[PDB]
Ligand binder design. Structure first.
Ligand SMILES: CCCCCCCCCO[C@@H]1O[C@H](CO)[C@@H](O)[C@H](O)[C@H]1O
Ligand SMILES: CCCCCCCCCO[C@@H]1O[C@H](CO)[C@@H](O)[C@H](O)[C@H]1O
Ligand SMILES: CCCCCCCCCO[C@@H]1O[C@H](CO)[C@@H](O)[C@H](O)[C@H]1O
Ligand SMILES: CCCCCCCCCO[C@@H]1O[C@H](CO)[C@@H](O)[C@H](O)[C@H]1O
Ligand SMILES: CCCCCCCCCO[C@@H]1O[C@H](CO)[C@@H](O)[C@H](O)[C@H]1O
Ligand SMILES: CCCCCCCCCO[C@@H]1O[C@H](CO)[C@@H](O)[C@H](O)[C@H]1O
Ligand SMILES: CCCCCCCCCO[C@@H]1O[C@H](CO)[C@@H](O)[C@H](O)[C@H]1O
Length: 181
């Protein structure tokens, strides 16, 4: 069993963008992919999403993609590519929105999407075991350690706590809806 198409293409894209950032510099890439940072860019619609593709350190991309691979992979395999697409688009938009509102447009990465996937997978498993989707006890512990790392600035993730809460809320809400149905 291997990662599905959405899980795989997201990982490829983040690596390619990370390479571009090392070659050209972070700023050069942000100029093109960042959330709109000037009114002249407000209708460059890719920017409301592409911020999620940028990472700012090895640790940032490593841990984001490990969680994405594991949690996104599981969602895609058990629940379908469509499910993963929607969790990803909604969490990237809302977490990105909240991030720019409080801290400005210069940010990036998949950490908001990961918070959504953590909340989704955990809650789905706690409310609906028969779904086949759940967050293993042991992995709950390491998810919490990753969360704490970002929460208390022990580990730089680009995004702020409120933005991460927004991502988490999306995952929890979708898991809640899916557990009812
Ligand atoms: C602390 C970092 C978070 C924990 C990282 C655990 C990663 C486990 C990934 O396993 C892989 O998942 C793929 C997608 O589901 C499967 O296709 C594949 O068969 C399986 O080998
Ligand atoms: C390979 C990882 C994905 C990179 C990000 C893709 C977004 C590119 C947006 O381009 C835009 C059109 O119209 C114009 C063009 O300037
Ligand atoms: C999905 C994201 C939103 C897509 C809206 C596309 C609107 O196109 C309009 O074109 C002109 C400005 O570019
Ligand atoms: C979410 C819905 C998508 C909104 C699309 C708006 C396209 C606006 C294009 O305007 C182009 O020129 C004028 C700006 O002054
Ligand atoms: C949230 C996941 C990131 C998805 C980014 C999709 C960018 C697609 C750009 O298409 C071409 O641009 C014009
Ligand atoms: C969103 C990722 C982290 C979820 C943390 C939930 C901790 C709850 C631990 O309670 C013990 O087990 C039960 C639910 O598992
Ligand atoms: C700093 C990184 C620490 C990561 C150390 C390895 C963690 C072990 C997790 O194993 C993974 O558990 C999943 C749930 O059972 C399986 O789906 C998957 O196949 C398996 O690979």
């Amino acid at each position: 069993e291997r990662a599905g198409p959405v899980t795989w293409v997201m990982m490829i894209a983040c690596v390619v963008v990370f390479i571009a950032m090392q070659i050209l510099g972070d700023q050069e890439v942000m100029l093109w992919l960042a959330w709109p940072f000037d009114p002249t860019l407000k209708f460059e619609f890719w920017r409301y999403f592409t911020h999620a593709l940028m990472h700012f350190s090895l640790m940032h991309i490593l841990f984001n993609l490990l969680w994405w691979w594991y949690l996104g992979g599981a969602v895609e395999k058990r629940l379908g590519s469509g499910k993963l697409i929607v969790i990803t688009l909604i969490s990237a938009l809302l977490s990105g929105y909240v991030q720019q509102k409080f801290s400005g447009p210069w940010f990036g990465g998949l950490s908001g999407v990961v918070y959504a996937l953590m909340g989704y997978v955990w809650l789905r498993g706690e409310r609906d075991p028969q779904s086949g989707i759940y967050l293993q006890r042991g992995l709950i512990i390491f998810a919490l350690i990753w969360i704490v790392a970002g929460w208390f600035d022990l580990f730089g993730m680009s995004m702020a706590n409120g933005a991460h809460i927004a991502g988490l809320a999306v995952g929890l809400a979708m898991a809640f809806v899916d557990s009812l149905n």
